[PDB]
Design a protein around this ligand. Sequence first.
Ligand SMILES: *[C@@H]1O[C@H](CO)[C@@H](O[C@@H]2O[C@H](CO)[C@@H](O[C@@H]3O[C@H](CO[C@H]4O[C@H](CO)[C@@H](O)[C@H](O)[C@@H]4O)[C@@H](O)[C@H](O[C@H]4O[C@H](CO)[C@@H](O)[C@H](O)[C@@H]4O)[C@@H]3O)[C@H](O)[C@H]2NC(C)=O)[C@H](O)[C@H]1NC(C)=O
Ligand SMILES: *[C@@H]1O[C@H](CO)[C@@H](O[C@@H]2O[C@H](CO)[C@@H](O[C@@H]3O[C@H](CO[C@H]4O[C@H](CO)[C@@H](O)[C@H](O)[C@@H]4O)[C@@H](O)[C@H](O[C@H]4O[C@H](CO)[C@@H](O)[C@H](O)[C@@H]4O)[C@@H]3O)[C@H](O)[C@H]2NC(C)=O)[C@H](O)[C@H]1NC(C)=O
Ligand SMILES: *[C@@H]1O[C@H](CO)[C@@H](O[C@@H]2O[C@H](CO)[C@@H](O[C@@H]3O[C@H](CO[C@H]4O[C@H](CO)[C@@H](O)[C@H](O)[C@@H]4O)[C@@H](O)[C@H](O[C@H]4O[C@H](CO)[C@@H](O)[C@H](O)[C@@H]4O)[C@@H]3O)[C@H](O)[C@H]2NC(C)=O)[C@H](O)[C@H]1NC(C)=O
Ligand SMILES: *[C@@H]1O[C@H](CO)[C@@H](O[C@@H]2O[C@H](CO)[C@@H](O[C@@H]3O[C@H](CO)[C@@H](O)[C@H](O)[C@@H]3O)[C@H](O)[C@H]2NC(C)=O)[C@H](O)[C@H]1NC(C)=O
Ligand SMILES: *[C@@H]1O[C@H](CO)[C@@H](O[C@@H]2O[C@H](CO)[C@@H](O[C@@H]3O[C@H](CO)[C@@H](O)[C@H](O)[C@@H]3O)[C@H](O)[C@H]2NC(C)=O)[C@H](O)[C@H]1NC(C)=O
Ligand SMILES: *[C@@H]1O[C@H](CO[C@@H]2O[C@@H](C)[C@@H](O)[C@@H](O)[C@@H]2O)[C@@H](O[C@@H]2O[C@H](CO)[C@@H](O)[C@H](O)[C@H]2NC(C)=O)[C@H](O)[C@H]1NC(C)=O
Ligand SMILES: *[C@@H]1O[C@H](CO[C@@H]2O[C@@H](C)[C@@H](O)[C@@H](O)[C@@H]2O)[C@@H](O[C@@H]2O[C@H](CO)[C@@H](O)[C@H](O)[C@H]2NC(C)=O)[C@H](O)[C@H]1NC(C)=O
Ligand SMILES: *[C@@H]1O[C@H](CO[C@@H]2O[C@@H](C)[C@@H](O)[C@@H](O)[C@@H]2O)[C@@H](O[C@@H]2O[C@H](CO)[C@@H](O)[C@H](O)[C@H]2NC(C)=O)[C@H](O)[C@H]1NC(C)=O
Ligand SMILES: *[C@@H]1O[C@H](CO)[C@@H](O[C@@H]2O[C@H](CO)[C@@H](O)[C@H](O)[C@H]2NC(C)=O)[C@H](O)[C@H]1NC(C)=O
Ligand SMILES: *[C@@H]1O[C@H](CO)[C@@H](O[C@@H]2O[C@H](CO)[C@@H](O)[C@H](O)[C@H]2NC(C)=O)[C@H](O)[C@H]1NC(C)=O
Ligand SMILES: *[C@@H]1O[C@H](CO)[C@@H](O[C@@H]2O[C@H](CO)[C@@H](O)[C@H](O)[C@H]2NC(C)=O)[C@H](O)[C@H]1NC(C)=O
Ligand SMILES: *[C@@H]1O[C@H](CO)[C@@H](O[C@@H]2O[C@H](CO)[C@@H](O)[C@H](O)[C@H]2NC(C)=O)[C@H](O)[C@H]1NC(C)=O
Ligand SMILES: *[C@@H]1O[C@H](CO)[C@@H](O[C@@H]2O[C@H](CO)[C@@H](O)[C@H](O)[C@H]2NC(C)=O)[C@H](O)[C@H]1NC(C)=O
Ligand SMILES: *[C@@H]1O[C@H](CO)[C@@H](O[C@@H]2O[C@H](CO)[C@@H](O)[C@H](O)[C@H]2NC(C)=O)[C@H](O)[C@H]1NC(C)=O
Ligand SMILES: *[C@@H]1O[C@H](CO)[C@@H](O[C@@H]2O[C@H](CO)[C@@H](O)[C@H](O)[C@H]2NC(C)=O)[C@H](O)[C@H]1NC(C)=O
Ligand SMILES: *[C@@H]1O[C@H](CO)[C@@H](O[C@@H]2O[C@H](CO)[C@@H](O)[C@H](O)[C@H]2NC(C)=O)[C@H](O)[C@H]1NC(C)=O
Ligand SMILES: *[C@@H]1O[C@H](CO)[C@@H](O[C@@H]2O[C@H](CO)[C@@H](O)[C@H](O)[C@H]2NC(C)=O)[C@H](O)[C@H]1NC(C)=O
Lengths: 197, 197, 197, 165, 165, 165
Amino acid sequence: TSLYKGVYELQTLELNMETLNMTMPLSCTKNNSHHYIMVGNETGLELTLTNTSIINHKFCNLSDAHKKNLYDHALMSIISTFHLSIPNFNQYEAMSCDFNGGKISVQYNLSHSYAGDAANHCGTVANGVLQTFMRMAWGGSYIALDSGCGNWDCIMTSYQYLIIQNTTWEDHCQFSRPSPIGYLGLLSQRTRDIYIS
Amino acid sequence: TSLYKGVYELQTLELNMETLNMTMPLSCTKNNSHHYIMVGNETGLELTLTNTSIINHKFCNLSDAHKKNLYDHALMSIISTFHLSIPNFNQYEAMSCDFNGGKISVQYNLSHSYAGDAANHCGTVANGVLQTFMRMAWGGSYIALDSGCGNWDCIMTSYQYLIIQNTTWEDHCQFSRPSPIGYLGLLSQRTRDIYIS
Amino acid sequence: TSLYKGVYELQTLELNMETLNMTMPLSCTKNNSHHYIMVGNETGLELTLTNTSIINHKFCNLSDAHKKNLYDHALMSIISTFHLSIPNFNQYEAMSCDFNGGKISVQYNLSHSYAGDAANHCGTVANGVLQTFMRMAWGGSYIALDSGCGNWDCIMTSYQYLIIQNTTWEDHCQFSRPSPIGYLGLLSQRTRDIYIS
Amino acid sequence: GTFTWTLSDSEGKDTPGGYCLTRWMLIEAELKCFGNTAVAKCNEKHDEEFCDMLRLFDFNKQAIQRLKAPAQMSIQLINKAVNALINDQLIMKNHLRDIMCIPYCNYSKYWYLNHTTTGRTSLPKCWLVSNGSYLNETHFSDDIEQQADNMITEMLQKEYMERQG
Amino acid sequence: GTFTWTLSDSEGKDTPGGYCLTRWMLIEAELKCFGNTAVAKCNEKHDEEFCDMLRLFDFNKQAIQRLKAPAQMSIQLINKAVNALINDQLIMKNHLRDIMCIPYCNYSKYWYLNHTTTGRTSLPKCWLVSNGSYLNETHFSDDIEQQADNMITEMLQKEYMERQG
Amino acid sequence: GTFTWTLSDSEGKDTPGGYCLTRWMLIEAELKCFGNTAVAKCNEKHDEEFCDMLRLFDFNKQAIQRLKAPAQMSIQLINKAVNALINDQLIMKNHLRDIMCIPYCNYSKYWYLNHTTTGRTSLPKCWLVSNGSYLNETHFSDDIEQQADNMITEMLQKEYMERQG
Ligand SMILES: *[C@@H]1O[C@H](CO)[C@@H](O[C@@H]2O[C@H](CO)[C@@H](O[C@@H]3O[C@H](CO[C@H]4O[C@H](CO)[C@@H](O)[C@H](O)[C@@H]4O)[C@@H](O)[C@H](O[C@H]4O[C@H](CO)[C@@H](O)[C@H](O)[C@@H]4O)[C@@H]3O)[C@H](O)[C@H]2NC(C)=O)[C@H](O)[C@H]1NC(C)=O
Ligand SMILES: *[C@@H]1O[C@H](CO)[C@@H](O[C@@H]2O[C@H](CO)[C@@H](O[C@@H]3O[C@H](CO[C@H]4O[C@H](CO)[C@@H](O)[C@H](O)[C@@H]4O)[C@@H](O)[C@H](O[C@H]4O[C@H](CO)[C@@H](O)[C@H](O)[C@@H]4O)[C@@H]3O)[C@H](O)[C@H]2NC(C)=O)[C@H](O)[C@H]1NC(C)=O
Ligand SMILES: *[C@@H]1O[C@H](CO)[C@@H](O[C@@H]2O[C@H](CO)[C@@H](O[C@@H]3O[C@H](CO[C@H]4O[C@H](CO)[C@@H](O)[C@H](O)[C@@H]4O)[C@@H](O)[C@H](O[C@H]4O[C@H](CO)[C@@H](O)[C@H](O)[C@@H]4O)[C@@H]3O)[C@H](O)[C@H]2NC(C)=O)[C@H](O)[C@H]1NC(C)=O
Ligand SMILES: *[C@@H]1O[C@H](CO)[C@@H](O[C@@H]2O[C@H](CO)[C@@H](O[C@@H]3O[C@H](CO)[C@@H](O)[C@H](O)[C@@H]3O)[C@H](O)[C@H]2NC(C)=O)[C@H](O)[C@H]1NC(C)=O
Ligand SMILES: *[C@@H]1O[C@H](CO)[C@@H](O[C@@H]2O[C@H](CO)[C@@H](O[C@@H]3O[C@H](CO)[C@@H](O)[C@H](O)[C@@H]3O)[C@H](O)[C@H]2NC(C)=O)[C@H](O)[C@H]1NC(C)=O
Ligand SMILES: *[C@@H]1O[C@H](CO[C@@H]2O[C@@H](C)[C@@H](O)[C@@H](O)[C@@H]2O)[C@@H](O[C@@H]2O[C@H](CO)[C@@H](O)[C@H](O)[C@H]2NC(C)=O)[C@H](O)[C@H]1NC(C)=O
Ligand SMILES: *[C@@H]1O[C@H](CO[C@@H]2O[C@@H](C)[C@@H](O)[C@@H](O)[C@@H]2O)[C@@H](O[C@@H]2O[C@H](CO)[C@@H](O)[C@H](O)[C@H]2NC(C)=O)[C@H](O)[C@H]1NC(C)=O
Ligand SMILES: *[C@@H]1O[C@H](CO[C@@H]2O[C@@H](C)[C@@H](O)[C@@H](O)[C@@H]2O)[C@@H](O[C@@H]2O[C@H](CO)[C@@H](O)[C@H](O)[C@H]2NC(C)=O)[C@H](O)[C@H]1NC(C)=O
Ligand SMILES: *[C@@H]1O[C@H](CO)[C@@H](O[C@@H]2O[C@H](CO)[C@@H](O)[C@H](O)[C@H]2NC(C)=O)[C@H](O)[C@H]1NC(C)=O
Ligand SMILES: *[C@@H]1O[C@H](CO)[C@@H](O[C@@H]2O[C@H](CO)[C@@H](O)[C@H](O)[C@H]2NC(C)=O)[C@H](O)[C@H]1NC(C)=O
Ligand SMILES: *[C@@H]1O[C@H](CO)[C@@H](O[C@@H]2O[C@H](CO)[C@@H](O)[C@H](O)[C@H]2NC(C)=O)[C@H](O)[C@H]1NC(C)=O
Ligand SMILES: *[C@@H]1O[C@H](CO)[C@@H](O[C@@H]2O[C@H](CO)[C@@H](O)[C@H](O)[C@H]2NC(C)=O)[C@H](O)[C@H]1NC(C)=O
Ligand SMILES: *[C@@H]1O[C@H](CO)[C@@H](O[C@@H]2O[C@H](CO)[C@@H](O)[C@H](O)[C@H]2NC(C)=O)[C@H](O)[C@H]1NC(C)=O
Ligand SMILES: *[C@@H]1O[C@H](CO)[C@@H](O[C@@H]2O[C@H](CO)[C@@H](O)[C@H](O)[C@H]2NC(C)=O)[C@H](O)[C@H]1NC(C)=O
Ligand SMILES: *[C@@H]1O[C@H](CO)[C@@H](O[C@@H]2O[C@H](CO)[C@@H](O)[C@H](O)[C@H]2NC(C)=O)[C@H](O)[C@H]1NC(C)=O
Ligand SMILES: *[C@@H]1O[C@H](CO)[C@@H](O[C@@H]2O[C@H](CO)[C@@H](O)[C@H](O)[C@H]2NC(C)=O)[C@H](O)[C@H]1NC(C)=O
Ligand SMILES: *[C@@H]1O[C@H](CO)[C@@H](O[C@@H]2O[C@H](CO)[C@@H](O)[C@H](O)[C@H]2NC(C)=O)[C@H](O)[C@H]1NC(C)=O
């Protein structure tokens, strides 16, 4: 390559973040419709954008799940980090869960990209949930939006639901290099966008 | 002016924060009894200290307002930032609201500067609400207190209510230069003074 | 002592943190079973690890205490800081209180070091409460654990209850130098380990 | 971009030796240009106060020119800008000084030294206030003299090294 | 330990002049060793980006070798490591640049200058991306040239002072 | 005020070359004065540990002398002082080192080097502990030698420039 000032060779370095799996979660993409968060070499979450309507009730039995604690605390912690990072999340009926003991089973209803709230306007529930999604899958999530860069409040997708389910570790990642940055960026939220009750 | 070391002229610079209106709110004063927070060049909040008793019920219908979302999210966000920054706010019956759809209508009852809580002692509800007020209107709010600098817990005013209402943009500001610092200082709260339930 | 490079004498300095009592709380130890947090030169909290079962009901009357405000706000603030810093505190029935007006009276039930939650496994309620305890009494708390350094999630003690009660100032501290660091470290929590409802 | 404090990657495509503050961001100033030597100093965090406003002005401009203006504030966006750009300890310290009756930064008026024959200037420092008004010039004598010595020292050291290496 | 950026107190019990990145943490690199002169720079906070990964790699290793691996992630532990080791303003700035359509750090590819006869290298800088791909080399010409001048300056100043004192 | 680390604006109205620690804040020390050259170093953030205590002592004093003592702690005030004055990464790192079985800062005992004929001293560094006790002197040999070289270097560079410019 190019020689700078007649004495320096430009050289590059690429870091392998795949060896950080034992201490921190790694986020990656696969094909837009699917993104993954892996922990260790055993399990993780599958984040999908799909027209599937898998949960058909309007409530999340969290307190019940906490009493029947049959779940991996690491996965619940990651999900909580995701949930609590959704700015201005007012539409609680849009979040439904079916833990059934140890499953994750979490569904966010963004139907028609406003989920019944008024109309598909900018700055709505879909925007709130999608911004967190885009950050959690920052390694690669840009493929999800065609126009969102020019106006951050008009992030909209066509998919009706954001589905979070637990899966096993598989070599799921492609189209990118697994990275903890999305997750780390969410942990250091600092400012929370919370409306008064 | 003065020449330093025989070679430097002291010079001054004054920044115009009035051109930051499109991206961040600007706080200013007017006549103690009134302070303002303006957004863009269209609207904002009028913060007043007055013996008016405008809301005559003891509740704030926030969940109802969130379902009937006829409000500017920017104003609700600013108000929330204010509310959640009141340290040790235990007296919930002191906060009353009447959104009536799209209005702000927020009243904080500091009557007799303790609002019925014991007596007008230092470190009470009036102090909590006023400290946040003093910071939100930091550009200029010092005119509100005659003795508070010598003992931060004895900030007291004579006015019974802190009223927050939405208004239109008008060139309201005088006695100071509009500045985002109060607001920015509140966003970076870092530590929250919250008692256990 | 040793002379470095032939010209410097190594010298030491020891700071007296006991003179910081008027503006910040100081934490110290005494005999493992007891630790203290002192404020000013008048009062403070006694933190104990004991098989005493002092509170025999499963609830904490906080809202009632807030209405009947007969308590030192400083002590309530310190306790709140402690409580809100317990990661993943799901077992609410484990926290019982009897303020009776102005007392602190706070009991955390870690019985059998899982408090009835499954079995005495790593990463449980005892671990959550003890990690906060260990930090609040960081000046000296290491005497509490024989093996915890090798695995932070397996911090366990044999004592059934963590008891927090208010006492008077006495020269309680021994085995260490009073220090605000534990408390300060808890105030700057930054990241909160909170599960979804 | 010679300024790590800015968001733009095109910041350096301007007068190589100076950064200019437009007339629009100043009060009756018309034009103020500071040497890049001084402006670049806040690439490092020095708890400088002045560059917190420059970071907000830089943000403000980028948020207007690169994005379609949303025309709805996007408070949720400024919130991230604040956490990324603002020195919180400085705001809190000025707050503490205010409430502790200690002179503090107003975030409006700044002062700098301007060399009378070279046109070289210092980075600006915040003019302090106390009890509703500005502190008198005499109370800044020590600060001004030190700033003047710092500039003299830099000029001499620069000249020394140009001659030496 | 010559590195205040590390957690280990045994960090300096290695080649006195260099810090090595194991083959295991690199992608097809086999071995990369950077001089301690450059690596030690991030003992100070310079919003460098590269050393945030080094701090995570250092943490990761210490968390594995000194503790019994819990084999259960201990997310509650990484959370403290993050707050202690990570520069949050940099992550937020790269986020803002991304959403504001400004080239930003990928946290994968880095570049550095390597002197062709001495083997001395610069601390690495993050290679920027924009719209799904990497920026072309021409857009880094200014950054590379400045880094090259910084290294030249350091070599000359070092030589100057070795001769002078 | 030559110290940007302090809250007081009258900090410099004292011995121009030194900052003194009163007998009241020390354990059986009677009097300790450190040169301003070294004390002023923590005007910049170096993750120094020692000056976090100095900032608390400075705060503590200002909070007592300028305000009517409220005599009720004002925990809500210390909370702001903490966020403005304390280096959180250092506390968290010492916490992590403790729980990771790595020697860490006790925030009590500090050491410094004292030149035997000039009386000039270094800024103090925190003495480390591990498993209930203090680390032995031999384990600090590398740190002490480096600090000694840093002081020697500074003395020589100062002398060099006094002669040169
Ligand atoms: C920083 O920015 C860059 C720019 O996008 C991102 O770049 C991606 O990097 C990842 C790896 O970290 C790339 O993933 C791999 O790309 C290979 C590209 O090979 C091409 O050419 C071969 C020729 O035979 C084709 O076969 C192939 O299809 C491509 O056309 C793929 O070959 C790799 O696939 C292999 O590995 C994956 C797992 O990693 C397996 O699932 C596959 O079966 C196969 O074994 C792989 O896809 C990605 O392509 C890069 N994209 C681009 C456009 O550069 C970085 O990810 C980003 N870093 C971060 C995290 O910010
Ligand atoms: C930093 O600290 C300083 C010190 O208080 C604060 O100073 C204030 O700065 C604001 C402007 O930013 C000043 O506001 C303006 O003051 C003018 C003063 O003029 C005087 O003399 C004329 C002579 O004819 C009189 O007419 C006038 O009444 C005054 O006696 C006013 O003239 C200005 O009024 C005009 O503009 C306002 C809108 O800005 C209009 O509403 C009016 O109708 C009129 O057109 C204006 O009031 C303020 O006076 C300053 N106070 C002092 C004591 O200095 C800074 O605000 C502060 N900065 C921050 C934000 O920290
Ligand atoms: C940093 O790390 C060090 C290492 O542990 C901690 O060290 C402790 O420091 C505290 C003081 O800050 C020590 O407390 C005092 O220790 C004295 C030790 O004296 C010994 O020798 C005499 C000989 O007659 C014996 O009588 C005595 O029992 C000891 O064997 C005690 O004498 C002191 O007791 C006196 O003061 C206390 C109150 O301080 C009174 O309650 C007593 O009645 C008596 O008057 C006192 O105990 C402690 O011993 C040190 N431990 C060790 C092993 O060094 C620092 O605390 C730590 N700093 C922090 C906060 O991180
Ligand atoms: C609200 O904020 C805007 C900044 O976003 C404030 O400033 C005004 O902004 C417009 C658009 O950039 C400027 O327009 C320009 O005018 C010059 C005139 O010579 C022209 O050459 C340019 O092509 C362009 O049209 C306008 O000058 C500027 N005005 C200023 C700084 O005075 C606006 O003033 C703020 N409004 C309120 C109520 O605070
Ligand atoms: C999950 O994380 C681990 C790191 O904790 C990843 O790397 C593998 O870690 C093991 C244990 O340290 C390495 O074992 C060593 O192999 C060498 C081979 O020459 C041997 O000499 C040593 O004595 C030791 O046995 C292993 O090499 C290393 N593999 C790498 C970096 O490729 C692991 O790959 C991660 N797994 C997943 C699914 O991501
Ligand atoms: C997922 O759905 C969206 C939105 O379509 C709605 O929901 C569907 C499940 C179905 O009930 C439709 O009748 C609803 O209208 C699909 O996106 C397209 O959106 C544009 C407007 O933005 C609309 O004009 C198109 O007709 C929609 N496409 C179709 C086939 O109707 C999206 O393509 C669906 N994705 C998948 C994988 O099915
Ligand atoms: C606002 O009210 C305060 C407090 O007065 C009380 O509330 C009034 C509405 C009325 O019901 C009074 O009878 C109540 O006592 C006024 O402040 C003064 O406070 C001092 C003690 O600090 C008291 O001795 C004075 O009598 C009060 N002033 C008056 C006229 O009673 C304050 O002035 C009122 N402000 C306005 C604009 O009306
Ligand atoms: C506090 O209790 C623990 C745990 O013992 C249980 O609770 C007691 C109050 C009593 O009801 C016991 O029968 C319960 O088993 C004591 O710790 C020991 O724990 C080990 C296992 O880790 C067990 O084998 C021992 O038998 C327990 N010790 C005794 C005497 O039973 C702890 O010692 C008690 N501490 C004090 C001060 O009483
Ligand atoms: C979530 O909790 C509700 C109760 O709060 C569960 O609904 C009850 O289910 C039982 C049968 O198991 C019925 O007899 C009750 O009449 C139901 N009550 C209500 C209000 O519907 C619900 O099944 C739980 N769901 C999940 C996914 O755990
Ligand atoms: C989500 O996690 C749970 C718990 O790890 C998985 O449930 C286990 O599945 C195996 C195989 O079917 C059973 O033998 C276990 O008894 C189940 N345990 C529990 C607590 O239910 C579940 O399969 C995972 N989800 C997915 C999609 O793999
Ligand atoms: C997800 O949310 C949408 C929007 O609220 C639900 O769609 C509504 O369904 C009812 C009953 O079929 C219709 O009367 C409404 O008109 C639909 N709303 C809109 C905007 O078309 C949808 O049922 C929810 N899905 C799940 C699985 O809960
Ligand atoms: C806040 O909500 C309460 C209900 O929770 C509203 O009060 C009810 O108003 C209807 C008439 O619209 C009456 O028939 C009910 O009897 C009232 N219930 C109670 C408990 O008072 C109240 O009006 C709402 N207020 C605002 C400002 O929105
Ligand atoms: C607070 O904001 C609301 C909404 O922007 C304002 O209400 C509007 O007022 C105009 C003029 O009276 C009506 O034509 C609109 O239909 C109203 N909209 C709604 C949603 O009610 C309200 O006037 C503002 N408050 C003040 C004091 O100006
Ligand atoms: C604001 O709060 C005050 C204080 O609680 C209320 O004043 C009380 O009113 C009742 C009924 O008139 C009296 O019996 C009490 O003695 C008053 N309290 C005191 C301390 O004098 C006031 O009504 C509230 N105002 C509004 C609009 O809610
Ligand atoms: C905590 O609050 C409960 C009520 O929510 C108190 O229990 C009541 O006590 C009265 C007598 O004072 C009885 O008549 C009621 O029947 C009790 N109700 C219930 C639900 O038990 C309880 O005593 C309070 N405890 C403390 C420590 O304050
Ligand atoms: C905890 O604090 C309360 C309030 O400061 C103490 O209660 C006081 O005790 C004295 C002596 O018995 C009584 O004269 C007071 O009337 C009590 N005040 C209240 C509000 O109850 C209590 O003693 C302290 N706890 C301990 C263990 O000392
Ligand atoms: C503290 O918690 C323990 C654990 O939940 C309680 O112990 C239980 O007591 C009941 C009734 O005696 C027994 O049937 C259970 O078997 C006990 N649990 C276990 C694990 O042995 C204890 O009573 C609670 N103490 C207080 C003061 O609330």
